[PDB]
Enzyme design. Structure first.
Site, mmCIF file in Angstrom:
data_model
loop_
_atom_site.group_PDB
_atom_site.id
_atom_site.type_symbol
_atom_site.label_atom_id
_atom_site.label_comp_id
_atom_site.label_asym_id
_atom_site.label_seq_id
_atom_site.Cartn_x
_atom_site.Cartn_y
_atom_site.Cartn_z
ATOM 1 N N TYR A 159 0.799 -1.226 0.000
ATOM 2 C CA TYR A 159 0.000 0.000 0.000
ATOM 3 C C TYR A 159 0.832 1.277 0.000
ATOM 4 O O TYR A 159 0.305 2.358 -0.276
ATOM 5 C CB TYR A 159 -0.979 -0.001 1.180
ATOM 6 C CG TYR A 159 -2.204 -0.849 0.935
ATOM 7 C CD1 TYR A 159 -2.090 -2.131 0.403
ATOM 8 C CD2 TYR A 159 -3.477 -0.371 1.233
ATOM 9 C CE1 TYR A 159 -3.203 -2.912 0.163
ATOM 10 C CE2 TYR A 159 -4.608 -1.154 1.004
ATOM 11 C CZ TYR A 159 -4.457 -2.427 0.469
ATOM 12 O OH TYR A 159 -5.553 -3.222 0.231
ATOM 13 N N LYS A 229 0.713 -13.744 6.333
ATOM 14 C CA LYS A 229 0.970 -14.794 5.352
ATOM 15 C C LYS A 229 2.398 -15.353 5.490
ATOM 16 O O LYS A 229 3.103 -15.562 4.498
ATOM 17 C CB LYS A 229 0.729 -14.258 3.937
ATOM 18 C CG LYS A 229 -0.635 -14.578 3.348
ATOM 19 C CD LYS A 229 -0.606 -15.834 2.463
ATOM 20 C CE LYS A 229 -1.033 -17.085 3.213
ATOM 21 N NZ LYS A 229 -1.232 -18.266 2.329
#
Ligand SMILES: Nc1ncnc2c1ncn2[C@@H]1O[C@H](COP(=O)(O)OP(=O)(O)OP(=O)(O)O)[C@@H](O)[C@H]1O
Ligand SMILES: Nc1ncnc2c1ncn2[C@@H]1O[C@H](COP(=O)(O)O)[C@@H](O)[C@H]1O
Ligand SMILES: [Mg+2]
Lengths: 415, 554
Positions: A159, A229
């Site tokens: 981002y 993750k």
């Protein structure tokens, strides 16, 4: 110069020693906001004041001070002054503030005011509390079991926006460096190839986990869950887990549970145990549908926090009534999270749920947890009774249609 | 022995360059006659870029010849300037060579011509000996244009109808005409420029000759007001293509009209931009000596990409490109310069401001406000260097100072306010029709001139109309969408949504209704599509440097 009147009898919220001294007479800045901000802001002020009067007998009162940003700021300060430098300064000084919606831009060229405030005030934490309200329309069977608080990192990850277009030389130049200088063997197609960079750092990681663990301490939450993750991205997402676990050990004295990473951190105020755990991201998104009760406070990276918050809001039927906040080293800004809906503005029609619930975030952040509860009781009271604004009324059956101001009164009548 | 050679080599460069300038200008008639508007646009770009080829050529020559001193050359160059007809521009040409040789360094008086250091009639008189009916026939006949006229008698009937209204039938019999020998060419217009000599005084006389689609030439109007000529020769308009074998004589002649324009501005109008720049510096230096003043940040809203300053009573702003832009402006420094380069080459239609690139500009430390010194040193550190009592700004632009539309709108009531918003819409329409997209339509990015006209000046977000994808805003799929903070639909770079323009343009309760009655089209994507369709079909929208009401057809 300045056209904000500092209230005569109020007093400034002070930060000292990293703890918030909240006076019984606090000055809270508030931006009205563009469009429907005109309907929803009055409603908030009425409810937030009502909660304080009832909860504290009158021993406390909030001195509201309107500051400016957006279309209205044009009407007081001059023609194209949409963000006055004093607004930022007043927010930094008074530590805590609340705003309605500001116009977000379609189209790439123009300037967004919401993002201006964030990066300008250096608010690197996106805080999103999600819970069900009895009677809210929902797509899931048991939404009542969802009561989470998402600590979303807002200054790193993909981002950040560090990217180059395909065939841009810059990209080819970047790809070149990785392929021969770094020896990267794993880009399947090096031609016609866009590139993005994903940075995750210890300094950036620990601000977030630190904030979240404290919140768990301050508000009696059961656990903090680091979502990541780790199993695919081992040095970005995996390091985020590793650092978060390292922080709970070093700074909060977390003891191991059964040798597994999981930590038992002791709340200094109460003694009660706060569990520090971690789960994989793709799994978590299933786990929130199947077993929401397990989870409490969630700390995660930028992309993940955004995905999870958008999914959680759907499950609880609170997309249109989602509270939000952005926190920095020195101040906090609670926002309505919907748009400005210019189409409806001024008809006193829209749902003030979002801003009101950001006010409850605010009240809890001031340590005035008692008053926050009366809003919660008010919101669930007025929803159960089916006395609601159009957005819910049309969906529920046997509901009473109320205007924005009226629904606010309903919230007050159920306190 | 090179002393004289170098000086002669430079003057050879000037003779060469100005001859070519005249030739490129001589083709203005044939381009107009054949309606080749893309070549008309192309010639403007070539004339502008002509001077710089020869300066470069001369410099390389001097380098190959040369691979106290400069004063020997300076004086040699000075010595062949008497009995040389265009000495003024030759001095400027000299300057341009030194400036490239020394990378714009150590520019003072005796090393170069920072100060001036020092036939064939260009009009002919016309008297109404046999009435204005025939007089105007003779003027029109004396034009070299090789196209036909529909109803010369219509146009001649028009021009007298104007002249009769302007002044008395007794003044008109005692008044006469002195029209210049050449035609001033711009866009799709050929201008007749003359003087109206009345007993009460001397007046502007301007007849623009236009061309019917694949047809005749008509005179669109007649202009005789001092202020109207200003507009026609405006700073915001493209330079005139006019054949001037002796420009200094033309500048003196034009000066009787256009009494408000400075020497530099008058040189600009005819297309001697590089000499205009030499005179711009002298006009600057003269003003500076004449007052005790400090450079301050220009009024209005601060720049997010440009840092701009000025002097309190001065009629020009200095704009410099910051080292760092605001976080939301994802631009390279090179791109802003590219935008500025674009507008300077482009046809400005009296809606864009003219700039002057200055390299290594020198300011005195004592002349800068402490507030500006810190701003310059903080936001533009890389651009400046220190020289004791003076500082050197590497690169800046100079343009006409107007009063920012954001400021003007706060000081204006009912009637004048109606004039402001009309000027804005028309500005936006004219620019869009001229293949220009104004990035930040925000009022803070437009200036208001002495004439009350609106001119654009932020080139942060400029681009060609042909480069953008104009889109409608999709209707909501579900109710939920009406209250979302973010679009559910994908948005590409280059995508423009005229609908959203309302929020920044109609915040104020006064201005909104006016937009809604005067410029509803600005907020519909279909209007910008139609415009861009015509630019894609090769059509060029005609600009009138005058009120639409002034036209004969209305
Ligand atoms: N020609 C001019 N006349 C008067 N003032 C000017 C002029 N040009 C610039 N200014 C002043 O300088 C300011 C900044 O310059 P400009 O607006 O051209 O670029 P910018 O501010 O970088 O763009 P943005 O609007 O995206 O921030 C203007 O807002 C205005 O106050
Ligand atoms: N930094 C400067 N200061 C003063 N005058 C300049 C500067 N740069 C260029 N000029 C003048 O501007 C005219 C055109 O210069 P150039 O744009 O370099 O061809 C010449 O007469 C120069 O003397
Ligand atoms: Mg600007």
């Amino acid at each position: 110069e300045s056209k904000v009147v500092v209230p005569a009898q109020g007093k400034k919220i002070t930060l000292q020693n990293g703890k918030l001294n909240v006076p019984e007479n606090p000055i809270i800045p508030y931006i009205e906001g563009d469009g429907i901000g005109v309907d929803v802001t009055p409603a908030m002020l009425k409810v937030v004041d009502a909660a304080v009067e009832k909860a504290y007998k009158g021993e406390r009162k909030i001195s509201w001070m309107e500051i400016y940003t957006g279309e209205k700021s044009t009407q007081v300060y001059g023609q194209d002054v949409w963000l006055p430098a004093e607004t930022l300064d007043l927010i930094r000084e008074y530590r805590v503030a609340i705003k309605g919606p500001l116009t977000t831009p379609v189209g790439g060229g123009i300037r967004s005011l919401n993002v201006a405030l964030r990066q300008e005030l250096d608010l690197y934490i996106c805080l999103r509390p999600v819970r069900y309200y009895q009677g809210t329309p929902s797509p899931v069977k048991h939404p009542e079991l969802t009561d989470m608080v998402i600590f979303r990192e807002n200054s790193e990850d993909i981002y950040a926006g560090i990217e180059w277009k395909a065939d841009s030389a810059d990209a080819e130049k970047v790809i070149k460096f990785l392929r021969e200088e770094m020896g990267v063997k794993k880009i399947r197609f090096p031609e016609h190839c866009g590139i993005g960079i994903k940075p995750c750092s210890e300094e950036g990681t620990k601000r977030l986990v630190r904030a979240a663990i404290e919140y768990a301490i301050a508000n009696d939450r059961d656990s903090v869950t680091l979502v990541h993750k780790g199993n695919i991205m081992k040095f970005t997402e995996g390091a985020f887990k590793d650092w978060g676990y390292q922080l709970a050990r070093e700074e909060f004295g977390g003891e191991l549970i059964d040798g597994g990473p999981w930590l038992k951190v002791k709340n200094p105020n109460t003694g009660k145990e706060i569990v520090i755990k971690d789960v994989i991201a793709d799994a978590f998104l299933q786990q929130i549908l199947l077993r929401p009760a397990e989870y409490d406070v969630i700390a995660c990276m930028n992309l993940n926090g955004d995905y999870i918050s958008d999914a959680l809001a759907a499950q609880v039927g609170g997309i249109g009534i989602a509270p939000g906040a952005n926190i920095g080293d020195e101040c906090a800004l609670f926002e309505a999270t919907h748009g400005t809906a210019p189409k409806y503005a001024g008809q006193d029609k829209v749902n003030p749920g979002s801003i009101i619930l950001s006010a409850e975030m605010m009240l809890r952040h001031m340590g005035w947890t008692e008053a926050a509860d009366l809003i919660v009781k008010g919101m669930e009271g007025a929803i159960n009774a089916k006395t609601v604004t159009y957005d819910f009324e049309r969906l529920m059956d046997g509901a009473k249609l109320l205007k924005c101001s009226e629904f606010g009164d309903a919230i007050i009548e159920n306190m | 022995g090179l002393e004289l050679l170098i000086a002669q080599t430079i003057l050879q460069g000037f003779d060469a360059q100005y001859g070519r300038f005249l030739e490129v200008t001589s083709g203005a008639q044939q381009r107009f006659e054949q309606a080749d508007w893309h070549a008309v646009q192309q010639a403007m770009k070539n004339r502008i870029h002509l001077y710089d080829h020869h300066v470069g050529l001369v410099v390389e020559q001097l380098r190959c010849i040369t691979n106290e001193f400069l004063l020997r050359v300076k004086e040699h160059y000075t010595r062949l300037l008497p009995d040389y007809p265009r000495f003024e521009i030759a001095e400027s040409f000299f300057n341009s060579v030194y400036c490239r040789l020394f990378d714009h360094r150590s520019l003072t008086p005796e090393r170069l011509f920072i100060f001036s250091s020092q036939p064939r009639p260009l009009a002919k008189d016309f008297h109404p000996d046999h009435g204005w009916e025939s007089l105007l026939m003779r003027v029109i006949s004396d034009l070299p244009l090789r196209l036909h006229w529909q109803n010369k008698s219509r146009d001649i009937h028009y021009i007298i109808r104007h002249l009769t209204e302007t002044l008395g039938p007794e003044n008109l019999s005692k008044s006469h005409l002195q029209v210049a020998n050449e035609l001033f060419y711009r866009n799709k217009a050929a201008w007749l420029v003359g003087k109206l000599i009345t007993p009460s005084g001397t007046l502007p006389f301007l007849l623009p000759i236009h061309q019917t689609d694949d047809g005749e030439l008509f005179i669109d109007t007649c202009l005789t007001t001092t202020a109207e000529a200003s507009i026609v020769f405006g700073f915001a308009r493209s330079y005139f293509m006019v054949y001037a074998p002796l420009p200094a004589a033309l500048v003196e002649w034009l000066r009787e009209i256009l009494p408000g324009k400075t020497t530099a501005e008058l040189y600009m109008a005819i297309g001697c931009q590089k000499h205009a720049k030499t005179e711009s510096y002298r006009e600057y230096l003269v003003y500076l000596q004449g007052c005790n003043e400090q450079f301050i940040e220009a009024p209005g809203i601060r720049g997010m990409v440009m840092l701009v300053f000025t002097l309190p009573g001065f009629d020009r702003v200095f704009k410099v490109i910051k080292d760092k832009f605001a976080p939301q402006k994802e631009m390279s420094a090179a791109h802003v310069r590219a935008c500025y380069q674009l507008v300077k080459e482009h046809d400005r239609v009296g809606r864009m401001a003219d700039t002057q690139e200055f390299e290594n500009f020198v300011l005195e430390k004592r002349h800068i406000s402490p507030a500006l010194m810190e701003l310059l040193l903080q936001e533009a550190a890389e651009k400046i260097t220190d020289l004791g009592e003076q500082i050197v700004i590497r690169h800046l632009y100079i343009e006409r100072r107007m009063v920012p539309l954001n400021i003007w709108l706060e000081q204006v009531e009912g009637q004048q306010l109606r004039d402001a918003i009309e000027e804005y819409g028309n500005a936006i329409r004219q620019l869009a029709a001229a293949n220009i997209f104004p990035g930040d339509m925000l009022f803070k990015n437009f200036g208001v001139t002495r004439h009350g006209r609106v001119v654009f000046y932020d080139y942060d977000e400029i681009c060609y109309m042909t480069e953008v994808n104009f889109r409608d805003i999709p209707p909501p799929r579900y109710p939920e969408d009406e209250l979302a903070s973010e679009p559910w639909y994908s948005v590409s770079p280059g995508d423009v949504f005229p609908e959203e323009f309302r929020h920044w343009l109609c915040a104020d309760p006064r201005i909104g209704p006016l937009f809604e009655e005067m410029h509803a089209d600005l907020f519909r994507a279909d209007y910008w599509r139609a415009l861009q369709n015509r630019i894609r079909e090769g059509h060029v929208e005609d600009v009138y440097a005058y009120r639409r009401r002034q036209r004969f057809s209305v």
